[PDB]
Design a protein around this motif. Structure first.
Motif, PDB file in Angstrom:
ATOM      1  N   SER A  78      17.417  83.579 -60.592  1.00 32.01           N
ATOM      2  CA  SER A  78      17.346  82.512 -59.597  1.00 32.01           C
ATOM      3  C   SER A  78      18.651  82.363 -58.829  1.00 32.01           C
ATOM      4  N   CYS A  81      19.664  85.791 -54.413  1.00 32.70           N
ATOM      5  CA  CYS A  81      18.646  85.721 -53.378  1.00 32.70           C
ATOM      6  C   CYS A  81      18.744  86.934 -52.471  1.00 32.70           C
ATOM      7  N   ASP A  89      13.614  84.267 -51.036  1.00 34.26           N
ATOM      8  CA  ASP A  89      14.035  83.719 -52.320  1.00 34.26           C
ATOM      9  C   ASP A  89      14.739  82.378 -52.151  1.00 34.26           C
ATOM     10  N   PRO A  91      17.320  81.521 -50.004  1.00 28.26           N
ATOM     11  CA  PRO A  91      18.749  81.836 -50.151  1.00 28.26           C
ATOM     12  C   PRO A  91      19.658  80.624 -50.266  1.00 28.26           C
TER      13      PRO A  91
END
Length: 155
Positions: A78, A81, A89, A91
């Motif tokens: 996580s 990104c 994702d 960012p």
DNA sequence: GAAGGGGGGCTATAAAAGGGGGTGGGGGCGCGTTCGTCCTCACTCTCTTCCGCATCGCTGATCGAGAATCCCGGTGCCGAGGCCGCTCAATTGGTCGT
């Protein structure tokens, strides 16, 4: 860098030469693909310990970098990104960013969503800016990336 | 042929015996109206795959127009037919010296 990572003498030499003191020195490191250039980049980020931006020449490279960061660093998925048009994702939600020269260096109109991240990227200052396959960097568009992104040290 | 008269059975009453059937009791089951479900389908409404334009690495191909030729003006040469000046060579002769 998780202890699973093994550092070879030439890799250690290149890093020691890049980190001649407590201050990182900007410049280019030439290492074959089989020599683990990716690990050196990941190690440099782990050394700088500050928000860093990795730029690849292709989406495949961006995928490779994500895998390498997870493979060699304590960072979680996580926290990484992949700012890319093909994949998202969030960012802005994490500190480590990965993208491509084609995206940031893009000369035509940006998509509204990609513009959000890019403005956040523009306003944030990057402690380390890793550039892969820099032989392409002198290109008229790719070199613009260096003026767009604000980075303390660029490797 | 019509009708009345006679003999015998029914009817009840008690009692026992052992046994079967007549009966209503609880019962299982199928049937069947009722109902919604799980379900197909044919409408169709979103995640998804993917076509588009600019850029890269490296090269070739087009391109205009400065410039290799072509071309303008000078050199001179020798080409050409004038011609003259003039000489020499060819001719005659005599003369005479070597």
């Amino acid at each position: 860098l998780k202890p699973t990572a093994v550092l070879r003498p030439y890799q250690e030499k290149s890093l020691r030469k890049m980190f001649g003191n407590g201050r990182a020195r900007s410049g280019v490191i030439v290492l074959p693909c089989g020599a683990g250039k990716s690990l050196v980049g990941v190690t440099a980020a782990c050394t700088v310990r500050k928000r860093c931006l990795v730029l690849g020449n292709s989406a495949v490279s961006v995928e490779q970098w994500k895998a390498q960061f997870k493979m060699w660093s304590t960072i979680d998925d996580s926290q990484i990104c992949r700012f890319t048009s093909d994949a998202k994702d969030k960012p802005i939600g994490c500190s480590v960013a990965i993208s491509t020269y084609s995206m940031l260096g893009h000369t035509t109109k940006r998509s509204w969503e990609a513009e959000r991240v890019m403005e956040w990227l523009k306003t944030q200052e990057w402690g380390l800016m890793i550039l892969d396959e820099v032989h392409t960097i002198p290109a008229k568009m790719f070199r613009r990336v260096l003026t767009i992104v604000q980075a303390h040290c660029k490797l």
